[PDB]
């Protein structure tokens, strides 16, 4: 949409990747 409402920028995407890691780190330990 707009850049200035998306602020800013790369630590928000990185804090999206850590639950993407997390949804495998949380589901592996259930199987262990």
């Amino acid at each position: 949409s707009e850049s200035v409402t998306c602020q800013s920028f790369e630590l928000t995407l990185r804090s999206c990747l850590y639950p993407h890691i997390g949804k495998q780190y949380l589901e592996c330990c259930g199987n262990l």
């Binding site: 707009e2 200035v4 409402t5 602020q7």
Partner: protein, 95 residues
């Protein structure tokens, strides 16, 4: 951020106040100038709606009114008889 993410003050995982915050961001960046009233009247809105949601947090999780009369009864000694039996016994072996 430490304990639990649905316990946030602004409303960040659990509410939609941060999209109101996004609207505030849209309002405050395109302005080329700066003054005092426009900056500080919306310093209310990032504070006041945030200052009430944590008040509506700690009422229900704790029974607020419980321990905050209990902790005063231990220090200002509201239960007056309930410590004198301690004082009578603690006198005879603090000698």
């Amino acid at each position: 951020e430490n304990q639990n993410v649905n316990m946030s003050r602004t409303g960040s995982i659990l509410k939609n106040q941060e999209d109101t915050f996004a609207a505030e961001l849209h309002r405050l960046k395109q302005q080329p100038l700066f003054s005092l009233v426009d900056f500080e009247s919306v310093l209310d809105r990032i504070r006041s709606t945030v200052a009430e949601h944590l008040w509506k947090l700690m009422v229900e999780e704790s029974d607020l009114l419980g321990q905050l009369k209990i902790i005063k009864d231990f220090y200002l000694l509201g239960r007056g008889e309930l410590f004198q039996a301690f004082i009578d016994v603690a006198q005879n072996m603090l000698k």
